[PDB]
Design a protein around this nucleic acid. Structure first.
Length: 216
DNA sequence: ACCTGAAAAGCAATGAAGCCAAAGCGTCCTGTAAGGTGA
């Protein structure tokens, strides 16, 4: 049951319609039998996990930060540059508490996502609230950069790590012991689900060989 | 008192480069510190 767990979790590529959703019930465990048990407190708390489903994780270096992001990479940019627009945007994850990292596997495992069944749907559709920025800058832990716009007057920028770029880089760099440079983090369930699967190690992109300067 | 060190042609062919055997076992790879949300 470990290969079924990794296949729905956002650091493996994606994937006869009854075996799946009766496994998706059973990924809140920490089968068809407990798939029948319907707690009204299990249905109303599972809606909280899509409410903190996040596009770009603000908690990525510092797990103390505080904010929710469900937005898309804005605009378009030329060929020699590379951002989270040019890669197809569907690997998203859960950026909230470690209490609900397994209870978020019922409605945020996502090719698209699952975001008295009708009663649940009416509340979810109204508050689904996609394309959401909820950050307050004062009592949290965010980076901040002044950069000039036009002739005068700077703009403050808070870079936030996109999740669809992380799981993209983590998958392609498996076979490369030379262009990959692993950073490990701790208290990883407070980070999010997209950091649980890799175990905390994130497999960055190193600049290949060493540096050697020829005469100029 | 100083100034000079020459040109012209050549640098050979024939044959071979052996094997045979092996590459040891016993035993281990340390522990302590550093949590964000919710009732």
């Amino acid at each position: 049951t470990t290969e079924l767990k990794r296949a729905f979790r956002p650091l493996t590529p994606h994937i006869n319609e009854l075996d799946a959703l009766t496994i998706l019930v059973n990924l809140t465990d920490k089968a068809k039998c407990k798939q029948k048990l319907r707690d009204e407190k299990w249905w109303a708390s599972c809606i909280n996990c899509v409410n903190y489903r996040q596009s770009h994780n603000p908690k990525f270096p510092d797990i103390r930060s505080e904010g929710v992001i469900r937005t898309q990479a804005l605009g378009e940019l030329p060929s020699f540059l590379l951002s989270s627009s040019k890669i197809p945007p569907y690997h998203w994850s859960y950026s909230h508490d470690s209490k609900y990292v397994n209870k978020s596997a019922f409605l945020t495992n996502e090719i698209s996502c699952l975001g008295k069944t009708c009663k649940a749907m009416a509340k979810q559709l109204a508050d689904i609230t996609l394309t959401t920025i909820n950050v307050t800058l004062a009592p949290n832990y965010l980076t901040q950069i002044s950069l000039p716009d036009s002739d005068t007057s700077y703009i403050s920028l808070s870079p936030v790590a996109s999740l669809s770029m992380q799981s993209h880089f983590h998958q392609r760099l498996q076979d490369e012991n030379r262009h990959s440079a692993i950073t490990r983090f701790s208290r990883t369930t407070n980070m999010g689900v997209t950091a649980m699967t890799c175990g905390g190690a994130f497999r960055m992109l190193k600049s290949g060989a060493k540096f050697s300067s020829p005469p100029h």
